[PDB]
Design a protein around this ligand. Structure first.
Ligand SMILES: NCCCC[C@@](N)(CC[C@](N)(CCCCN)C(=O)O)C(=O)O
Ligand SMILES: NCCCC[C@@](N)(CC[C@](N)(CCCCN)C(=O)O)C(=O)O
Ligand SMILES: [Mg+2]
Ligand SMILES: [Mg+2]
Ligand SMILES: [Mg+2]
Ligand SMILES: [Mg+2]
Ligand SMILES: [Mg+2]
Ligand SMILES: [Mg+2]
Lengths: 296, 296, 306, 296
């Protein structure tokens, strides 16, 4: 299978006057490239995919593709939906805009059965000829892609090559790679990046890497090179910031931190997201001081 | 406050060859009207709101509004979204096209904070002058509207008049009505319709009533009259069908039951929803045989 | 031989308003005089039964001798009254639970409460055999007790109903499970059983669905209010029962701001009803902030003295 | 600190005609010693601690102490209780009868607060001069020793040197060793032995090792030697048996497997534990066929 692995960043989407700040978006991607990141994920959960329009979805994918052009850095475009017809359309558009592959979150809200998830992802994978990474995050979607369903999809669909797990379930991570060691298991939970990689996971799709791309990329590369002691050292050092970045729903903390670090102009969200509480604003700022934040 | 209470049905959306079957949709609503139902909810969760287009959403609301004219039956239009801008747009459409009120599910997938939920619903409520019922279903959305947030919205926004709860949490139901007895608590979980009503809830938004509208209407009206012996008797008798209608994710079982009773022409869903397993198909049929199902 | 048709055969029951008694300590010993005085106060404020050495009575840290002494005081104090003694007798070990059941029978308890085995997580078959052994060891009523947040296991509706139908003296269940759906499930499929509320905040919803009593924490502090709530409900005066349930919500919830019985003993101490705020380790006093919160919530209520 | 780490077995307690089979118990321990195990845990959860008398509990500890004489194998005696006075008494017995350390499960059923847990373990630790390992298993006890409480106990009490985690929470495993790298984190969940060891855990207290002691010992020793690839290979191979040994509550499956293997004479439990279902008995037998089970 063709794959997209390594250290990847779920890009925030900066807003300016209620609009996507396209100059800031490109500038933030160049900063990721300069700090060792292997791929960027425009318009995932961290990029506020649910509140962007389709036009804005396209704009972000195009900026990511153009900015990464000529670098080794790939674009794994967010393209999931609760509706299969919409997810198929987003997959086809992402392929046409030049994306290297697609990330596709399990349908949220409508709780498809395992048979329904299989048909959903089979339809998506059949619509394109680029790699497709499944994305399991049951705390947000209300459903779980089972290990059996993930493995069946990997085996039955040429394009489907692994899964981004955001499920707090290292047992499932063992289950997946013990029964199907050819798949690419990707960490979707920064605090446990190292345990997922040390069990044979092959990358991360990170929130923390927005702020500390050098540290998350180094963690990932240490682990892929089997230097577990050094990968664990960075994972341990990052625990405090990894946890505070979820003191409110992601991406409220990471955007707050990027604004405090001077990396975006304006702490703007799209409703129903909004600024953190005064107390959590202070906690994020405090945890940040313990880390060296790369500039532009 | 202007309110919409009583026995209400979360309408299924029939499909025929991939499109909304508009003749069947109207016929099903007339059947609800003729069996004692007080309001109908087009394009809620049970109506596959997440997989309908904007145009189909609007078509279903218009059919409901037209079919309920000249009757006492109200239209409480589904209008929720994960994006506040889209929820406001749907609210405004429902108002301008004659809906009596709106139902608005808590944003799914993006997990807004309580402050974000407050701002989300304040924007929706300020956009229309018709009643707004909140809708909490954490198992599907990934978030909870807290009791404090529900009560503040009810007290701060003239047209927010209560909440549809689908949370399995009778403690919260007591909390809500003990601290704000003027709100309209609406049961969103059929199996516990009677306990919610007997604590002072004032209606149901029912899945089971698609199949058995006369029974749910009678349960509700006995309860509103404090004829609790009779209301509990029906609630007890309905437990088996109330539970089997969730043997797979709603609306897979209820649409299956409607098809099995000849009330819709085709067992068609929009992906990622799909037909139930053959085993559950048979289980639903066997439970149906214990109930008296009205025709057209 | 055994059989599956006990459901409509005569079952002695213990229902109504019941109190899960705190166990007061003085210098680390059971304060036996205070214990009797607190029970008399329950009797005089309309309570129908008392539960010595349940969860609220710190059953896990009493010695077997102290457990037996508390049952004896409860039995002696309730003689000559309408008030029944439903003795705590559960255990993670079936052999211990049988021994406690037999003691309660031989020392004059009216019935036993028997919590689902904690920590060892028996299967539903194991729970069935556990309670079959207990029920067949005595001839007094047995109330099952489901509290999965504490035990790590659940007695399923099907197992509860099987036990009710298969054993003469098992007559119902005390539910502390935050699960009104299960409460409907139970009484819809087996309306002959006695469902007893084990969670004060939802006493009225359980009673209004046909539950027939409560085993209360709040009634340690406010026995007249819990008794009135229950008797109104049993008479189908649901307006008055709900009014009391709503008024009690604040205290009902603050009594669990830390693990029960830490808040209720704190409230009883603040009310002057016990001499010292003494627990047995690993239980201990609440945080200073929760101490203050409990004190504040109490102010809205009229607390009966002795 | 003095410590007890490495590959350890939570010993089953065999019964014959309702009594502890003392000869089988000693024979089973010798089998563990001869298959690479570093310590044995008499009368833990797997040993049916809840249904043994205090006399039987003490007998099992004495047999373990006697059988390990003349070997490097340590006895980490089960000594926990919901009552602090009982836990202190069991700790003092274990010390005075030659145990090398104690395992002490968090109080079950009565849900102490973190302050209560601290006072509980402080009292236990001060009662003896041998190592004390905390044991967190919230699914069984109804409470959780927080990371902060574990770390305070480790720092404040000379004897307390780590924690056995059976919590399905690799995030907390990271939390513990990131903030207090000097403690000994011990895996209490066989399926994730390798992830816990690869994060710097220093041992296991295993159920599976009752049946497959050579494989669990080899896994643990490869990990401790930083041969993570070979440790992961065994962890992956063992996943199927690791999971089937929990198809019913432990120790129902492990005793079933030991009986099927001819390692214990009769499939006897103490109520409320009992035989598995016919169906799960067959599932256990089938999974066993893929593994080489050492004899005596
Ligand atoms: N990635 C950019 C598009 C975001 C679109 C949408 N806001 C709504 C998508 C929708 N399928 C719209 C249904 C409209 C009829 N009710 C949904 O709400 O699930 C979402 O996916 O959350
Ligand atoms: N109700 C008064 C007696 C309390 C006894 C005990 N503390 C311990 C009971 C025991 N079966 C003892 C096991 C002894 C060997 N470890 C238990 O801990 O489960 C409990 O049940 O929690
Ligand atoms: Mg690279
Ligand atoms: Mg809605
Ligand atoms: Mg008497
Ligand atoms: Mg039945
Ligand atoms: Mg009367
Ligand atoms: Mg509570």
């Amino acid at each position: 299978k063709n794959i997209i692995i390594g250290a990847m960043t779920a890009l925030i989407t900066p807003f300016k006057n209620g609009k996507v700040d396209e100059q800031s978006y490109a500038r933030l991607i160049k900063r990721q490239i300069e700090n060792g990141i292997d791929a960027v994920v425009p318009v995932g959960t961290t990029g506020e995919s649910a509140t962007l329009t389709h036009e804005e979805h396209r704009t972000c994918i195009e900026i990511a593709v153009e900015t990464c052009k000529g670098t080794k850095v790939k674009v794994l475009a967010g393209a999931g939906s609760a509706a299969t017809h919409e997810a198929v359309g987003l997959a086809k558009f992402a392929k046409e805009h030049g994306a290297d592959g697609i990330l596709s979150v399990a349908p949220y809200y409508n709780k498809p059965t395992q048979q329904g998830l299989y048909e959903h992802y089979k339809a998506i994978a059949q619509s394109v000829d680029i790699p497709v990474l499944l994305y399991n995050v049951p705390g947000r979607t209300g459903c779980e892609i089972s290990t059996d369903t993930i493995i069946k999809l990997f085996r039955d669909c040429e394009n489907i090559y692994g899964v981004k797990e955001a499920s707090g379930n290292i047992d499932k991570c063992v289950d997946l790679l013990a029964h199907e060691p050819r798949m690419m298991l990707i960490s979707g939970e920064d605090a446990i990046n190292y345990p997922i990689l040390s069990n044979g996971g092959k990358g991360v799709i990170s929130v923390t890497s927005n702020l500390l791309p050098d540290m998350i990329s180094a963690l990932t590369h240490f682990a892929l090179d089997e230097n577990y002691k050094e990968a664990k050292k960075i994972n341990d050092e990052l625990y405090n910031i990894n946890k505070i970045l979820f003191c409110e729903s992601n991406p409220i903390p990471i955007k707050t931190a990027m604004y405090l670090a001077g990396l975006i102009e304006s702490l703007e969200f799209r409703l129903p997201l909004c600024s953190p509480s005064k107390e959590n604003f202070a906690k994020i700022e405090e945890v940040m001081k313990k880390y060296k934040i790369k500039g532009f």
